[PDB]
Design a protein around this ligand. Structure first.
Ligand SMILES: Nc1ncnc2c1ncn2[C@@H]1O[C@H](COP(=O)(O)OP(=O)(O)OP(=O)(O)O)[C@@H](O)[C@H]1O
Ligand SMILES: [Mg+2]
Lengths: 267, 221
């Protein structure tokens, strides 16, 4: 697709606002030492207090709580910019960095029983116990192939959940050359990331007496794979989104709602 | 319309009470006292509750204790036949109607149902229990709760309810040793406990004793 965007006032202004938020030169901020600690520890994500952001810039906090995905993208872009600024060498290792959230969310502090469609597409906080966990599985991101017949190597890029909706043109594994010469997959050069799924239930101590419990399903990405175990009391902060069903003609009109974690805390 | 007039005319008769007493259980010989008691049990009384503080029931419970062969079950069968709303159950096991409420998928209709016990189903009716001693712990607990509080509480499968159990209880039983002992009290002769016995207004004892004339008449019938 050759379509590109030239100007966008909102996105550029939000990126500038986050750039000013994470400067910490004329202020008593600490995020600079946090970034230096991340570089020292080879980790690739940051946790930022929501109350701190609201104190410094209330409008940005309101927009981020009300709208998650675009603001999170702007955060990640700003992190990439400042990591490049402080030490451009370290930013080469990882594609993109991530943002965690922390602080008192207030009204959005929501129990698994009180999660509703009113909080869709926003960042929510939930307290619960872990009941089901699944095995860690790798997922392909970048694929590399070699052709012994013509001595040529090719690479294909994959982006499935990066974009909201995917199409059959993507997510196709190449196996043959343009002249039907067989290709040999080379697993060393490819790129994979880990994936896990967990389930969280409202704690029996908090649930009303005599009533059945209610649960939420969470997806854990590459960094947060081993941070949870069954039978554990945790607090999860993350986005609440709908799940796109696969292609079909007739739809009943009922989506599946899945919480995508950004921060997992052992209370 | 004319039936009401006939009822009033029968009431005008001075010996209607004895007629009603003798009208119960045509097929059972003897036990006139039991029939007289069952008359009051069927007709019943009147509940009284000054304000919402002091509830007093009007249902007259009946307990029968008898040696084998005295035809205790025939009385319950007759009462079920006569009563407009009467439920029958047995404590031995495999009863068609249970004595405890539970939530289950019905085997036939394949639907998720709340099946209340026989006590709940007999609202303003009669509940009959056969083999009263053979009941297990759960049945005894449910009967005690329904007789003393006149309500049944359910907490199962996310369902919390209280249901009304305004019913009259009639029960039959056998002594501990298989034969009644005149030298021991009623409580010592029966497997039941004193709190359960205290609930019943009328207790009847049917003791088998060899009377040649009575045996001859019973055999003739
Ligand atoms: N006075 C009576 N008139 C008519 N039939 C009688 C009389 N006494 C006993 N019987 C008969 O005796 C038999 C005994 O069976 P029945 O079920 O009536 O006994 P039961 O008293 O309930 O005994 P159990 O203690 O074993 O439960 C019945 O067939 C019943 O018809
Ligand atoms: Mg019997």
């Amino acid at each position: 697709a050759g379509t590109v965007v030239l100007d966008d006032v909102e996105l550029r202004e939000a990126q500038r606002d986050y750039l000013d938020f994470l400067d910490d030169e004329e202020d008593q901020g600490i995020y600079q030492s946090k970034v230096r600690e991340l570089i020292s520890d080879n980790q690739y994500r940051l946790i930022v207090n929501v109350n701190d952001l609201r104190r410094k810039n209330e409008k940005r906090a309101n927009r981020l709580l009300n709208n998650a995905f675009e603001e999170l993208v702007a955060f990640q872009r700003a992190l990439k910019d400042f990591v490049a600024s402080i030490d451009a060498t370290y930013a080469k290792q990882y594609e993109e960095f991530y943002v965690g959230l922390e602080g008192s969310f207030g009204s959005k502090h929501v129990s698994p029983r009180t999660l509703t469609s009113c909080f869709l597409s926003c960042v929510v906080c939930v307290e619960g116990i872990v009941t089901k966990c699944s095995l860690v599985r790798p997922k392909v991101v970048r694929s590399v192939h070699y052709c012994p017949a013509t001595k040529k190597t090719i690479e294909r890029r994959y982006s499935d959940l990066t974009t909201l909706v995917a199409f059959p043109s993507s997510s196709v594994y190449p196996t043959k050359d343009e002249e039907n010469n067989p290709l040999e997959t080379e697993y060393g050069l490819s790129v994979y990331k880990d994936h896990q799924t967990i389930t969280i239930q409202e704690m029996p101590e908090k649930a009303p007496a005599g009533q059945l419990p209610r649960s939420v399903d969470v997806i854990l990405d590459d960094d947060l794979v081993d941070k949870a175990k069954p039978g554990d009391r945790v607090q999860v902060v993350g986005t609440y989104r709908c799940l796109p069903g696969k292609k079909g003609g007739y739809t009943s009109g009922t989506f599946r709602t899945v919480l995508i974690a950004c921060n997992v805390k052992q209370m | 319309d004319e039936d009401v007039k006939m009822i009033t005319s029968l009431s005008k008769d001075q010996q209607i009470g004895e007629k009603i007493f003798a009208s119960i259980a045509p097929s059972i010989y003897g036990h006139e006292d039991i029939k007289r008691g069952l008359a009051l049990a069927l007709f019943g009384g009147e509940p009284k509750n000054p304000g919402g503080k002091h509830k007093v029931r009007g249902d007259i419970n009946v307990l029968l204790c008898g040696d084998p062969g005295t035809a205790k079950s025939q009385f319950l069968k007759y009462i079920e036949k006569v009563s407009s709303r009467a439920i029958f159950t047995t404590g031995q096991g495999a009863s068609a109607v249970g004595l405890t409420a539970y939530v289950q998928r019905h085997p036939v209709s394949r639907e998720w149902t709340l099946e209340a016990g026989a006590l709940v189903l007999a609202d303003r009716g009669v509940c009959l229990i056969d083999e009263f001693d053979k009941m297990n712990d759960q049945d005894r607990t449910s009967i005690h709760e329904a007789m003393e509080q006149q309500s049944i509480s359910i907490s199962k499968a996310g369902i919390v309810t209280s249901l009304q159990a305004r019913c009259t209880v009639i029960a039959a039983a056998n002594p501990i040793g298989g034969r009644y002992d005149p030298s021991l009290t009623f409580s010592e002769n029966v497997d039941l406990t004193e709190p359960i016995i205290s609930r019943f207004d009328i207790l009847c004892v049917v003791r088998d004793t060899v009377d040649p004339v009575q045996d001859e008449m019973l055999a003739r019938f």
